[PDB]
């Protein structure tokens, strides 16, 4: 799992891989590790996938309720505070490492959330098992106040480095770009890994697979 | 009246809480009290009815020490007054344990007034039948004096009186010129005012419980030495 | 961290024809250092019952004060003192009431019953008790008990008359066994407090022992 | 005692007084059209000191559930907050169904904490619910004591009787397009005393695309040519 | 509570004719670290009772706060009575025992000195709830080093005079500073008597190193 | 007034002055405490012959050295007697000795008013170190030591007769006959063995039923 | 990381490093460890970052509420009491070293230390963190009495710089906070501006 | 009268009526006197008897070696107060091994009894307490009324017709500090004897004495123990 | 019956208890005026001080709930202080749970929800105090709201509460109908002249206490004697 985010000139760009593995075997090749919170803020997940999903869904629901009650747009700082309180209440039992990014009325914000409840505001954030490669790519090729296309390219390069240099991450690149007026999900943005075609018709026709008994129950 | 002055939770047709309007009557009926903020401190004073000579030296005293630098002079129903004094002591102890140092008088008065308002808000519990002055002094904040009605809220008082004869005491209190008089002459004058208030005209002989707080006592609210303030009582008699 | 530490001390009680002797050392120590030379393990509870507490000193103190409180409560609730058997049973109930985190103490109750006969009730740290003519509790239990039962009980001795013990003879044997145990067991010594329980009351004697 | 109570022989006297209270004076008409549902109400603020963009009568409970109400607005605030919490809890339990119209019946059913646990004093507000995430629209009414009624066109104001009569005479009908909001405004006009304007009238619409509280611009546009 | 971080080193005290003297150095040992060199481990319980502790200084501060609050509450009633040092020692004993029973021990070994009713009292309580009173007391390594001198002095002199008692305490502090890693050359000496409690302050002991030339 | 807790305007709260007058509806019971022991005599007052006399019991042994006689609502007396048994057994288990009848009565009085107050009066009788003793406990959580007590519908007349027929140095043999003649005077029918229950208290005996229809040797003399 | 406070006449100066370490990887090289508890009160955090942040936020809650209910700026001693209570009641669960300083009109510049355990002490200067244990001799030897604002600022900057260059868990930039009656001024020393004592060991 | 129905409700004229009715509970009770001295505190209680066959009931309850109380009034919620005071005193013994001072115990009783005077559904403890104790400041006598407003007193009496005893104590209270133990006990006996009508007279069976002193722990004297004090009665019924 | 005694719906279909509480706000003898302007919002209420033995320093009815929101209270002072404490607690709790400061409208909504809970149920009673709270809000300009004992939170531009609130509201309606925006001189003068026309005493600059929140300068300024005197001099010119 490798997730990353950057603060560009007009907002936040979030990137993530789509390799959810059970131990050392790939289970999901298109696991959405970028989760919607509010139409202005997203958040990338890492660690225990189920805990991350439950926590991010709870935060999204609570913040949607809060925005409906207030009638205004929500704020990244509020989501950070909710996440920090929830995680620190359990003292790290929620093995969920999160990358929160969003656009508020006070400007775009990007935060890192750790399972024990630690948070900080950073121009660029990386998390996950392959976080080190993406962090190195940022440190090498980060420029403050960098435009939309260049920021997307930088995030794509960091995600690709994490994919090709960490075996437990990859198979797709998921991107999201957000600003004061734009929310654009990209899903698979670049597929640098394609399955080779199967040489020959490695298929089994009918007649094989002898059956002891068969039951047919037709419906309406 | 009738069905509206039965529980504090029942509002009057005009928008009043008659339970507290009757609880104030107990304070109005009980013995009076006086507290004056001297130039560098606050001086208390309460007359207490010796209902029978069978009692020992002054007991169930209307003066109480709620904290190291804070004292409470109460009038009204004395049992609930003592319970509220215990509540104030607990509040001061809790504040000292949590935030350290000494509880500011304004905050202590606000908290105890909020507690009293909580007791008068509901229906199962009844409003407290007592009114008291909280007096304290510190070098940083000078001398403060807050008075709490059985249902009202704390108010800053240069000099206040409560009990049987509030107006009669307050007239001479306003006659007295505070804010420039030292706490010694203020002790003498509070004794004088209390004896000006009627003591044996229609009641028994009264005892003079007077309290002290100020830089002359470096805070540390304590009862004035009665042996050396008997002469202040004598001056009040004259 | 552990909530228990062995503080030494040696207690001993003997049930006579009409007297109850409860003797104990007063040396409080743990590990290799001695806190004090005066820390009695005997505690008088009524005019006719004295207990001995040895082992963890804090638990000894707590148990003694709980016993005092329970005796006072029972006296108020029944308008009478508590019999030696009754306080023995109450102590047994208290000890097992905290079975899963027991008082690391050994209790021996010496006193006079309703009949006016010497009664000694030894106790286990977790509550077991039995009436005995004599028992020793503490670190020096292993080195003190054999002397007192082979003398008082005349065990392994033939052609000897089982004469009932006089008060003076019992006191002499108590002093002998304690002075013998003080030198072998380092926890024992520096003093000895002996409580004599009879109809006339409780008489205490403090004798000096090996100061090392 | 501490629940919905005061039911004598054959009667629900306390509930009947609550229903007399919810008679109110805010019509808050609702129309279930083929394309969607329109909930229109009247915001007749006392004097011009009050504001119309500050407080709202129509509240979006969730993505495509909108809510309009009747007398006892302070009770309605707590009720709509509870409804939002309940819908959010349902969406969290059954994650990602986009639950609006398969939830509109469910959220109306879970409006049992609304009255079946009255809270000593029953709620004094009747609320109309709209949802359209099923390929079909839904209009439901929950009253201070009952449950879902599944209305097609109704009013809950001071002149709710004549408002409903106007709705049926004007043939709320079934082929009516989404722009039955004109008929809803006309029904309000019958129970309105004044020259209704964009801030005086608040209306929310719930179609298959979702729910949206119409801004004063569109409200004035519809009110034009009436 | 469970594992102290900043620990206060040894404290000792002896009673004499008409009063008691205790002494504690002003070092807060963060393990092997002399992190805090200007902290007071001696508290004035009331006008006629003093208290010192050895161990976790945070626990000592908590006990100081609680005990001062309860003394203030006791003196607020103005009943004329007071918490006698015997009563104070018993209360601390019960508190330590209760904390041990709850398996949240207070990492402090406390020495309580007082002089009430014309008779000196000098109590002692530790983490495990073991309590007693002795004419001379010491904690930690002080009970190993300073205590033997006190015992040998008291064996020949059951009663003591104030000047020689405080001189003996100063010599014991010198010995402790000589042969204790956690010790420091800055100790407070507090004396309780009929006049009240008086604390000298940051007293220091003179070091002797003539034996340093005996290495060769 | 009507509130179980509100005090009366004059001197003493009501709804307990109502609970105490529940022995009036209850049946008569008399106990005598002598130096020989304690004699507890009650009437069963069987309404129909079909009901088994053994079923109707007003005297129940709390323990081997304590006997109790009820007068009032048998339902509430069952709970009070059960609590008395539990307290006695708990005390014996804790202290390995026989709980004093005074202590048992004190505990039952403590449990009497702590729920609408119990409306039964108990006549505890048993042996202790302070000789045989008898205690009269009343519905208003109050117990009093007594030597010869009467309770029930006609407690006034029975107590008045007992006041002059009792003397301080009597034995069991005279006490039983005095109680039986008084009972026969109070009741409506005769003192048949199937209608009268008797309980004896002895220093060296447990408290058993009075001879179980062979007690006619005491009623024939009557 | 390293955190340090000094008290001068009429104010205090705080110096903290920007590194927060996780194992041997630099989690955040620009960490802002000078959390403003109130307008004139600041917090220096060391240890478990999550625990420090949670404690600081809770104390900021309580202190702001208390100041609002008094209509008076809170005392630095009051804030230190809040921190000591919070750390002491949960010491077995919360492991954090906190340095507290600020200015109030009641006393002026004050400095308090509440390390792991929950003890409070008032000091002329406070030092804490993983990298603090390497500059004890320097901070004790090179500290004078009555130092002015600039002297304390430079001395704290030097101490933090050496703690950074020596300790492996400390690095990045230095954050300074000068608290006084006029207000608080926060500055960042980065790159060449870092006071460096170069060690040119001869070949 | 509506306003007299419940304790919580407040009368328009001032003080509430239920507590005023509560003070009638102690008024409707057997008389009991209690007086201080220089070194001793003595309680003389009238053991009211139901009938000649039954005992004279129990008064002057026992609390601790240095504290003893005398009840007057509603006996139901009086053993409860006795248990509370016993528990508090034993708690004091258990925590700091010292006899709980009488003033602090009385303050605790007042605080405990104040809450029922304000909580709905809770009747006030309509019991009059004459607490005799010996703290470090000599003997102390305290009177606790159901209004939870305690009083300290040189010599106070409560019960039926206790006003005559109050007057006698007041007239003779000057010569109370300098009196022997027997002299003070005889003063109390004369005070109590003046309460009952002339037909009644002091007997060994209908009186109880509670004495606490500096060297004398609290002891409850009755008939055989009272007889030495009852001698020299100077009987003027 | 008890329809008008407890918080239950009347047979006619009304709620009389809150209707009485609203008049309870009128009880107490005080008035307040809130005026929102082009860029600022000012609130002024009279300071009825009987006798000078009181401390005019603390007799105020306006407070700072947070760093940017200030309230003014009308009605019984005890309930007013309780609701002020509750509002301060809510603001602090919101700032703790959500990083950004609590919007004034949300704070009013929460206070009104608490009041609606109070008018619900029957154990408690509504608090007889009406709170008008103001504060600068980004993307919204100045904002003024009123929360009542019922739970209806609303009010804007010009809103008044107190005994003579109707006359003040009428005059402010006349002023706002006059289409001209008020700067940070005209808003204060409008509020002052409104309260002066309501109660014609010419308003010596000691009997009123005005709170101001502007946009360029945030925070709830409780303007001192000099500022109110200067504004009064400028107005009466």
Curated annotation (Swiss-Prot), chain A:
EC code: 3.4.25.1
GO biological process, one term: proteasome-mediated ubiquitin-dependent protein catabolic process
Recorded GO CC terms: cilium; cytoplasm; cytosol; extracellular region; ficolin-1-rich granule lumen; nuclear body; nucleoplasm; nucleus
Signal sequence segment: none
GO MF assignments: endopeptidase activity; threonine-type endopeptidase activity
Location(s), subcellular: Cytoplasm; Nucleus
Family: Belongs to the peptidase T1B family.
Subunit note: The 26S proteasome consists of a 20S proteasome core and two 19S regulatory subunits. The 20S proteasome core is a barrel-shaped complex made of 28 subunits that are arranged in four stacked rings. The two outer rings are each formed by seven alpha subunits, and the two inner rings are formed by seven beta subunits. The proteolytic activity is exerted by three beta-subunits PSMB5, PSMB6 and PSMB7.
Function: Component of the 20S core proteasome complex involved in the proteolytic degradation of most intracellular proteins. This complex plays numerous essential roles within the cell by associating with different regulatory particles. Associated with two 19S regulatory particles, forms the 26S proteasome and thus participates in the ATP-dependent degradation of ubiquitinated proteins.
Protein name according to UniProt: Proteasome subunit beta type-7
Source species of the chain: Homo sapiens
Taxon lineage: Eukaryota, Metazoa, Chordata, Craniata, Vertebrata
Gene: PSMB7
Whole sequence portion shown: 44 to 263 of 277
UniProtKB/Swiss-Prot annotation, chain C:
Glycan attachment sites: 29, 180
Modification Phosphotyrosine occurs at: 121
Keyword Amino-acid biosynthesis found: no
Cellular-component GO terms for this entry: cytoplasm; cytosol; extracellular exosome; extracellular region; ficolin-1-rich granule lumen; nucleoplasm; nucleus; proteasome complex
GO BP terms, alphabetized: proteasome-mediated ubiquitin-dependent protein catabolic process; proteolysis involved in protein catabolic process
Modification Phosphoserine, positions: 33, 39, 133
SUPFAM superfamilies: N-terminal nucleophile aminohydrolases (Ntn hydrolases) (SSF56235)
Transmembrane segments: none
N6-acetyllysine: residues bearing it: 175
UniProt KW NADP keyword: no
Xref: InterPro entries: Ntn_hydrolases_N, Proteasome_bsu_CS, Proteasome_sua/b, Proteasome_suB-type
Subcellular localization, as worded in the UniProt entry: Cytoplasm; Nucleus
Keywords of this entry: Acetylation, Cytoplasm, Deafness, Glycoprotein, Host-virus interaction, Intellectual disability, Nucleus, Phosphoprotein, Proteasome
Subunit organization: The 26S proteasome consists of a 20S proteasome core and two 19S regulatory subunits. The 20S proteasome core is a barrel-shaped complex made of 28 subunits that are arranged in four stacked rings. The two outer rings are each formed by seven alpha subunits, and the two inner rings are formed by seven beta subunits. The proteolytic activity is exerted by three beta-subunits PSMB5, PSMB6 and PSMB7. Interacts with SERPINB2. Interacts with RFPL4A. (Microbial infection) Interacts with HIV-1 protein Tat.
Family recorded in the similarity comment: Belongs to the peptidase T1B family.
Name of the protein in its database record: Proteasome subunit beta type-1
Species in which this protein is naturally found: Homo sapiens (Human)
Lineage: Eukaryota, Metazoa, Chordata, Craniata, Vertebrata
Recorded name of the encoding gene: PSMB1
Curated annotation (Swiss-Prot), chain D:
Any one GO cellular component localisation term in the record: proteasome core complex, alpha-subunit complex
Annotated SMART domains: Proteasome_A_N
Name this protein carries in UniProt: Proteasome subunit alpha type-2
Keyword Ribosomal protein annotated: no
Pfam entry (one): Proteasome_A_N
Subunit relationships: The 26S proteasome consists of a 20S proteasome core and two 19S regulatory subunits. The 20S proteasome core is a barrel-shaped complex made of 28 subunits that are arranged in four stacked rings. The two outer rings are each formed by seven alpha subunits, and the two inner rings are formed by seven beta subunits. The proteolytic activity is exerted by three beta-subunits PSMB5, PSMB6 and PSMB7.
Keyword set includes Cytoplasm: yes
Phosphoserine modifications at: 7, 9
Cellular compartment(s): Cytoplasm; Nucleus
Function: Component of the 20S core proteasome complex involved in the proteolytic degradation of most intracellular proteins. This complex plays numerous essential roles within the cell by associating with different regulatory particles. Associated with two 19S regulatory particles, forms the 26S proteasome and thus participates in the ATP-dependent degradation of ubiquitinated proteins.
PTM annotation (Phosphotyrosine): residues: 17, 69, 114
Effect after changing residue 103 to V: In a colorectal cancer sample; somatic mutation
Post-translational modification N6-acetyllysine, affected residues: 63, 164
PANTHER family tied to this protein: PROTEASOME SUBUNIT ALPHA/BETA (PTHR11599)
Keywords: Acetylation, Cytoplasm, Nucleus, Phosphoprotein, Proteasome
InterPro entries, per the entry: Ntn_hydrolases_N, Proteasome_alpha, Proteasome_alpha-type, Proteasome_asu_N, Proteasome_sua/b
Protein family: Belongs to the peptidase T1A family.
Curated annotation (Swiss-Prot), chain I:
Residue(s) carrying Phosphoserine: 10, 56-57
Positions bearing Phosphotyrosine: 152
Domain of life of the source: Eukaryota
Record Pfam families: Proteasome, Proteasome_A_N
Repeat keyword on record: no
TM annotation in the entry: none
Disulphides: none
SMART domains documented for this protein: Proteasome_A_N
Residue list for modification N6-acetyllysine: 95, 97
GO MF entries: endopeptidase activity; NF-kappaB binding; purine ribonucleoside triphosphate binding; RNA binding
GO biological process, one term: proteasome-mediated ubiquitin-dependent protein catabolic process
GO cellular component: cilium; cytoplasm; cytosol; extracellular exosome; mitochondrion; myofibril; nuclear matrix; nucleoplasm
Major localisation: cytoplasm
Record's keyword terms, sorted: Acetylation, Cytoplasm, Glycoprotein, Nucleus, Phosphoprotein, Proteasome
Compartments (UniProt record): Cytoplasm; Nucleus
Subunit structure: The 26S proteasome consists of a 20S proteasome core and two 19S regulatory subunits. The 20S proteasome core is a barrel-shaped complex made of 28 subunits that are arranged in four stacked rings. The two outer rings are each formed by seven alpha subunits, and the two inner rings are formed by seven beta subunits. The proteolytic activity is exerted by three beta-subunits PSMB5, PSMB6 and PSMB7. Interacts with ALKBH4.
Protein function: Component of the 20S core proteasome complex involved in the proteolytic degradation of most intracellular proteins. This complex plays numerous essential roles within the cell by associating with different regulatory particles. Associated with two 19S regulatory particles, forms the 26S proteasome and thus participates in the ATP-dependent degradation of ubiquitinated proteins.
């Amino acid at each position: 799992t490798t997730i990353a985010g950057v603060v560009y000139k007009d907002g936040i760009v979030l990137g993530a891989d789509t390799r959810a593995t059970e131990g050392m075997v790939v289970a999901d090749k298109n696991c959405s590790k970028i989760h919607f919170i509010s139409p202005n803020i997203y958040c990338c997940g890492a660690g225990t996938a189920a805990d991350t999903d439950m926590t991010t869904q709870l935060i999204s629901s609570n913040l949607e309720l809060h925005s409906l009650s207030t009638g205004r747009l929500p704020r990244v700082v509020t989501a950070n505070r909710m996440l920090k309180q929830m995680l620190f209440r359990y003292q790290g039992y929620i093995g969920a490492a999160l990358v929160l990014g969003g656009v508020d009325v006070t400007g775009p914000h990007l935060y890192s959330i750790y399972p024990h409840g630690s948070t900080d505001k950073l121009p660029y954030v990386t998390m996950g098992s392959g976080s080190l490669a993406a962090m190195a790519v940022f440190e090498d090729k980060f420029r403050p106040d960098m435009e939309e296309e260049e920021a997307k390219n930088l995030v794509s390069e960091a995600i690709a480095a994490g994919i090709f240099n960490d075996l437990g991450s990859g198979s797709n690149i998921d991107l999201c770009v957000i600003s004061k007026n734009k929310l654009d999900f990209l899903r698979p943005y670049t597929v640098p890994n394609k399955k080779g075609t199967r040489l020959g018709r490695y298929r089994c026709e009918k007649g094989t697979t002898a059956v002891l008994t068969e039951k047919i129950t037709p419906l309406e | 009246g009738t069905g509206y002055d039965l529980s504090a939770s029942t509002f009057s047709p005009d928008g009043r809480v008659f339970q507290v309007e009757y609880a104030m009557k107990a304070v109005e009926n009980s013995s009076t009290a006086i507290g004056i903020r001297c130039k560098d401190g606050v001086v208390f004073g309460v007359e207490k009815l010796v209902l029978s000579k069978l009692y020992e030296e002054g007991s169930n005293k209307r003066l109480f020490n709620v904290d190291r630098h804070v004292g409470m002079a109460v009038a009204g129903l004395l049992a609930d007054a003592r319970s509220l004094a215990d509540i104030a002591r607990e509040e001061a102890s809790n504040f000292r344990s949590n935030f350290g140092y000494n509880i500011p008088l304004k905050h202590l008065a606000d908290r105890v007034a909020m507690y009293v308002h909580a007791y008068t808000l509901y229906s199962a519990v009844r409003p407290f039948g007592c009114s008291f002055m909280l007096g304290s002094y510190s070098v940083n904040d000078g001398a403060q004096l807050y008075m709490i009605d059985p249902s009202g809220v704390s108010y800053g008082y240069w000099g206040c009186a409560i009990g049987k004869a509030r107006q009669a005491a307050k007239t001479e209190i306003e006659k007295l010129q505070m804010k420039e008089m030292t706490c010694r002459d203020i002790v003498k004058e509070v004794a004088k005012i209390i004896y000006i208030v009627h003591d044996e005209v229609k009641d028994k002989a009264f005892e003079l419980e007077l309290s002290w707080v100020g830089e002359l006592t470096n805070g540390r609210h304590e009862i004035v030495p009665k042996d050396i303030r008997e002469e202040a009582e004598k001056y009040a008699k004259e | 961290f552990s909530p228990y530490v062995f503080n030494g001390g040696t207690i001993l009680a003997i049930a006579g024809e009409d007297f109850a002797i409860v003797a104990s050392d007063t040396r409080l120590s743990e590990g290799f250092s001695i806190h004090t030379r005066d820390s009695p393990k005997c505690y008088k509870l009524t005019d006719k019952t004295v207990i001995g507490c040895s082992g963890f000193h804090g638990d000894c103190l707590t148990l003694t004060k709980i016993i005092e409180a329970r005796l006072k409560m029972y006296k108020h609730s029944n308008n009478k003192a508590m019999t030696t058997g009754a306080i023995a049973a109450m102590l047994s109930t208290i000890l097992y009431s905290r079975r899963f985190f027991p008082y690391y103490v050994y209790n021996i109750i010496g006193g006079l019953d309703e009949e006016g006969k010497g009664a000694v009730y030894s106790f286990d740290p977790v509550g077991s008790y039995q009436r005995d003519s004599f028992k020793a509790g503490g670190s020096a239990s292993a080195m003190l008990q054999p002397l007192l039962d082979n003398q008082v009980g005349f065990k392994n001795m033939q052609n000897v008359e089982h004469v009932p013990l006089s008060l003076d003879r019992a006191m002499r044997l108590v002093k002998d066994v304690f002075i013998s145990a003080a030198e072998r067991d380092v926890y024992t010594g520096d003093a000895l407090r002996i409580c004599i329980v009879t109809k006339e009351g409780i008489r205490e004697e403090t004798v000096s022992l090996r100061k090392d | 005692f501490s629940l919905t109570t005061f039911s004598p022989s054959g009667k629900l006297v306390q509930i009947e007084y609550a229903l007399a209270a919810v008679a109110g004076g805010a019509p808050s008409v609702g129309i279930k059209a083929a394309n969607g549902v329109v909930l229109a109400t009247e915001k007749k603020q006392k004097s011009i000191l009050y504001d119309e963009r500050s407080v709202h009568k129509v509240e979006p409970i969730t993505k495509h559930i909108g809510l309009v109400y009747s007398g006892m607005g302070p009770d309605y605030r707590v009720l709509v907050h509870r409804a939002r919490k309940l819908a959010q809890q349902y969406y969290l339990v059954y994650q990602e169904p986009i639950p609006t119209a398969q939830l509109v019946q469910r959220v109306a059913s879970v409006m049992q904490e609304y009255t079946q646990s009255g809270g000593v004093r029953p709620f004094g507000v009747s609320l109309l619910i709209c949802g359209w995430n099923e390929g079909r629209p839904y209009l439901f009414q929950s009253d201070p004591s009952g449950a879902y009624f599944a209305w097609k066109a109704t009013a809950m104001g001071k002149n709710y009787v004549n408002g409903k009569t106007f709705l049926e005479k004007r043939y709320n009908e079934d082929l009516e397009l989404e722009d039955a909001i004109h008929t809803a405004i006309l029904t309000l006009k019958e129970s309105f005393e004044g020259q209704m304007t964009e801030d005086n009238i608040e209306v929310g619409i719930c179609n298959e695309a979702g729910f949206r509280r119409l801004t004063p611009t569109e409200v004035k546009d519809y009110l034009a040519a009436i | 509570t469970q594992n102290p971080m900043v620990t206060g080193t040894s404290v000792l005290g002896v009673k004499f004719e008409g009063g008691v003297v205790i002494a504690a150095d002003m070092l807060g040992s963060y393990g092997s670290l002399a992190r805090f060199r200007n902290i007071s481990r001696i508290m004035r319980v009331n006008n006629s009772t003093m208290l010192g502790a050895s161990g976790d200084y945070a626990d000592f501060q908590y006990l100081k706060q609680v005990l001062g609050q309860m003394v203030i509450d006791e003196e607020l009633l103005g009943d004329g009575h007071s918490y006698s040092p015997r009563a104070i020692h018993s209360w601390l004993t019960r508190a330590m025992y209760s904390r041990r029973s709850k398996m949240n021990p207070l990492w402090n070994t406390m020495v309580i000195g007082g002089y009430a009713d014309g008779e000196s009292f000098l109590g002692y309580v530790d983490m495990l709830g073991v309590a007693y009173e002795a004419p001379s007391l010491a904690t930690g390594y002080g009970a190993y080093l300073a205590q033997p001198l006190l015992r040998e002095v008291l064996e020949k002199q059951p009663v003591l005079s104030q000047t020689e008692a405080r001189d003996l305490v100063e010599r014991c502090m010198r010995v402790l500073y000589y042969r204790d890693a956690r010790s420091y050359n800055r100790f407070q000496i507090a004396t309780v008597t009929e006049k009240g409690v008086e604390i000298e302050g940051p007293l220091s002991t003179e070091t002797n190193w003539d034996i340093a030339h005996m290495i060769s | 007034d009507r509130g179980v807790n509100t005090f009366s305007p004059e001197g003493r709260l009501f709804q307990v002055e109502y609970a105490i007058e529940a022995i009036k509806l209850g049946s008569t019971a008399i106990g005598i405490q002598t130096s020989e022991g304690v004699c507890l005599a009650v009437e069963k007052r069987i309404t129909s012959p079909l009901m088994e006399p053994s079923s109707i019991e007003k005297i129940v042994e709390i323990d081997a050295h304590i006997g109790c006689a009820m007068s009032g609502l048998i339902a509430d007396a069952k709970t009070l007697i059960d609590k008395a048994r539990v307290e006695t057994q708990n005390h014996w288990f804790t202290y390995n000795e026989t709980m004093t009848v005074e202590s048992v009565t004190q505990a039952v009085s403590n449990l009497a008013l702590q729920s609408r107050p119990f409306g039964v009066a108990l006549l505890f009788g048993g042996v202790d170190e302070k000789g045989p003793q008898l205690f009269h406990m009343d519905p208003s959580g109050t117990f009093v030591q007594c030597d010869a007590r009467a309770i029930g519908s006609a407690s006034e007349g029975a107590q008045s007769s007992l006041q002059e027929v009792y003397h301080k140095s009597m034995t069991l043999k005279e006490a039983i006959k005095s109680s039986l003649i008084i009972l026969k005077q109070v009741m409506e029918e005769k003192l048949n063995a199937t209608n009268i229950e008797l309980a004896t208290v002895q220093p060296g005996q447990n408290f058993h039923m009075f001879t179980k229809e062979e007690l006619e040797e005491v009623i024939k003399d009557i | 990381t390293t955190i340090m406070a000094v008290q001068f006449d009429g104010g205090v100066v705080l110096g903290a490093d920007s590194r927060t370490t996780t194992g041997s990887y630099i989690a955040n090289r620009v960490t802002d460890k000078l959390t403003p508890i109130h307008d004139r009160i600041f917090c220096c955090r060391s240890g478990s970052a999550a625990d420090t942040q949670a404690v600081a936020d809770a104390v900021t809650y309580q202190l702001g509420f208390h100041s609002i209910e008094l209509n008076e700026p809170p005392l630095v001693h009051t804030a230190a009491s809040l921190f000591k209570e919070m750390c002491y009641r949960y010491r077995e669960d919360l492991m954090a070293g906190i340095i507290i300083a600020g200015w109030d009109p009641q006393e002026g510049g004050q400095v308090y230390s509440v390390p792991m355990g929950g003890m409070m002490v008032r000091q002329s200067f406070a030092i804490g963190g993983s990298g603090s244990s390497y500059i004890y001799g320097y901070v004790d030897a090179t500290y004078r009495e009555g130092m002015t604002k600039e002297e304390c600022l430079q001395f704290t900057a030097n101490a933090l710089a050496l703690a950074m260059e020596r300790d492996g868990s400390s690095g990045g930039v230095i954050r300074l906070a000068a608290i006084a009656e006029s207000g608080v001024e926060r500055q960042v020393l980065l790159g060449d501006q870092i006071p460096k004592f170069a060690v040119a060991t001869l070949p | 009268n509506q306003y007299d129905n419940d304790v919580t409700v407040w009368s328009p004229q001032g003080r509430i009526h239920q507590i005023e009715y509560a003070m009638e509970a102690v008024k409707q009770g057997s008389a009991t006197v209690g007086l201080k001295s220089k070194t001793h505190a003595v309680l003389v209680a009238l053991k009211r008897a139901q009938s000649e066959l039954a005992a004279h009931q129990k008064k002057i309850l026992h609390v601790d070696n240095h504290i003893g109380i005398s009840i007057a009034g509603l006996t139901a919620d009086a053993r409860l107060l006795c248990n509370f005071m016993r528990q508090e005193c034993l708690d004091s013994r258990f925590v700091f091994d010292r006899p709980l001072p009488v003033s602090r115990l009385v303050s605790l009783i007042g605080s405990k009894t104040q809450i029922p005077t304000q909580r709905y559904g809770r009747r006030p403890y309509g019991v009059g307490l004459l607490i005799a104790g010996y703290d470090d400041m000599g003997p102390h006598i305290f009177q606790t009324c159901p209004s939870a407003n305690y009083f300290d007193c040189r010599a106070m009496s409560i019960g039926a017709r206790s006003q005559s005893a109050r007057t006698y104590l007041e007239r003779h209270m000057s010569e109370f500090m300098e009196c022997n133990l027997n002299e003070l006990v005889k003063h109390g006996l004369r005070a109590l004897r003046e309460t009952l009508p002339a037909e009644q007279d002091l007997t060994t069976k209908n009186v109880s004495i509670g004495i606490v002193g500096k060297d004398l722990e609290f002891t409850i004297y009755d008939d055989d123990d009272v007889s030495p004090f009852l001698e020299g009665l100077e009987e003027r019924p | 019956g008890f329809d008008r005694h407890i918080t239950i719906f009347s047979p006619e279909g009304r709620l009389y208890q809150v209707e009485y509480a609203f008049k309870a706000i009128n009880q107490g003898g005080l008035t307040s005026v809130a005026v929102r302007g082009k860029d600022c919002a000012v609130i002024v209420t009279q300071k009825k001080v009987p006798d000078k033995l009181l401390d005019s320093s603390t007799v105020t009815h306006l407070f700072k709930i947070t760093e940017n929101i200030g309230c003014v209270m009308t009605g019984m002072t005890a309930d007013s202080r309780s609701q002020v404490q509750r509002a301060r607690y809510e603001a602090a709790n919101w700032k703790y749970k959500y990083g950004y400061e609590i919007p004034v409208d949300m704070l009013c909504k929460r206070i009104a929800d608490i009041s609606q809970v109070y008018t619900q149920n029957a154990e408690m009673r509504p608090l007889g105090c009406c709170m008008i709270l103001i504060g600068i809000d980004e993307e919204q300009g100045p904002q003024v709201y009123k929360c009542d004992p019922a739970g209806y939170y609303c009010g804007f531009k010009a809103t008044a509460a107190g005994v003579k609130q109707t006359e003040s509201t009428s005059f402010l309606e006349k002023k706002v109908k006059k289409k001209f925006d008020w700067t940070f001189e005209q808003t204060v003068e409008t509020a002052i002249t409104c309260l002066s026309t309501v109660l014609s005493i010419d308003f010596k600059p000691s009997e009123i206490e005005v709170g101001v929140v502007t946009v360029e300068n945030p925070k709830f300024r409780i303007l001192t004697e000099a500022e109110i005197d200067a504004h009064l001099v400028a107005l009466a010119e």
